[model samples]
Target: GLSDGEWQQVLNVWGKVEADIAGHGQEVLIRLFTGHPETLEKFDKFKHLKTEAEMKASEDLKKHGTVVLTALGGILKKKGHHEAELKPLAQSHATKHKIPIKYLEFISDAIIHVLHSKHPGDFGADAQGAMTKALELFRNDIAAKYKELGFQ
Candidate 1:
């Protein structure tokens, strides 16, 4: 669905933060949760993080962030196997986490926020557009699955 140039643009900008996986990943999650605190309820593992300090200090949070970021990298890298690779993750979010499709859709904004804050000038208009489309593709695919399962 994306052109070669657009795909390369996505990879280039994503590569900037791929090196600092923990840093950018945690930042993105923090921003997302900060904006939508209720979304945190999806994770039973995150329940013990009662305070900002506790949440930031939690090993589980760090581990979760890393794993998520790693999975994102896998999806970005394996373009040919994208649908197959993303299916398990999409279903897990829908069935296990009970995450709403709209919440999943908000991930693009969080990722863009991460790039703007941490990566600075690395995200120009073209790069931003590429990343937006890339994430939208992921979000839409998951959303279709979520809807197909008859979840609200």
Candidate 2:
């Protein structure tokens, strides 16, 4: 759970990130795939993408990335009470998407990296720490749903 001050810090930076949601979202996915190539296997639309150019040109990838970021925005707006939204998403990923829970950590790392790179000034130690805790809460919430569905 995020303390009031921590949530404020997260939202403070989030306001900036939210300004260019699609670009930041796509960049996060790119970073994730660049660092963890194996994670691409989880996405049918992206598994065949080989080069960065191919990924950047991918409309499907862009759409999915935007969806991912939009979901995060929704979660933040809910102040981390995200069960109603995350539950279905978690179940879908587990049962239909067949995505492992560990990829969440990879995406989380990618998110932090993108934020730090894009907004170096705003994403200082305090902001980064707050964002890290926020993502941890998000990850744990989804993990709980996975556990409930016996997906791990």
Candidate 3:
């Protein structure tokens, strides 16, 4: 369950782990494909987010994309993806496509609503869930930009 800063703590751990590995004379490529709960727990902002509830709410999305959005519509019509898998591609689509900021806010609010409806300790997600979370992250960024742009 990552809430922004959790991502940063991971890099902090990497710095420590890298130093240790270097001291031991190892050339290992250390990386984590998964997020860390410990690092996440240490983050107050992340703690305030109801990630468990959000996960439960999106428990049934059926995972949409690891990359490559569909050209056709269906139950999996929405795009799903992994980290760094869709940012450049999505942004490319955005600049030319000009998606509205209000739409992004709606999506964020919807996620919050979904999160609020779920019972505690029931959060979980599949690949689609991961992608949904990724999209939420992007939506938040969009909102941040809107504020910086000052209601223009």
lDDT tens per residue, model 2, 2-103: 899999988998897779887888899999999999999888778999999998888788788889998887888777888798778888888998878789
Q: How well is each residue in 51-88 modelled by candidate 3, as lDDT tens digits? A: 54443233121122111112111111223223344344
The per-residue C-alpha lDDT of model 3 at residue 87 equals: 47
lDDT assessment of candidate 2: 0.87
Candidate 2, which segments miss by more than 4 Å at Cα? none
The clash count for each model shown is 0, 0, 2
Ten residues in sequence with the least summed lDDT for candidate 1? 47-56
Candidate 3, clashing residue pairs?
A: 63-128, 65-80
In what order do the candidates fall by TM-score, top score first? 2, 1, 3
lDDT of all predictions = 0.80, 0.87, 0.35
Instruction: Put down candidate 1 lDDT per residue, 1-152, tens digits, no spaces.
Output: 67889889988987887788888778777777777888787777776566777767776777778888889888987653588888898888878787887887666788898899886886799999988888888887777777788877
Candidate 1: list runs displaced more than 4 Å: none
TM-score, each model? 0.92, 0.93, 0.28
Task: Assess candidate 1 and give its lDDT.
Answer: 0.80
Whichever of 2 and 3 has more lDDT, that candidate is 2
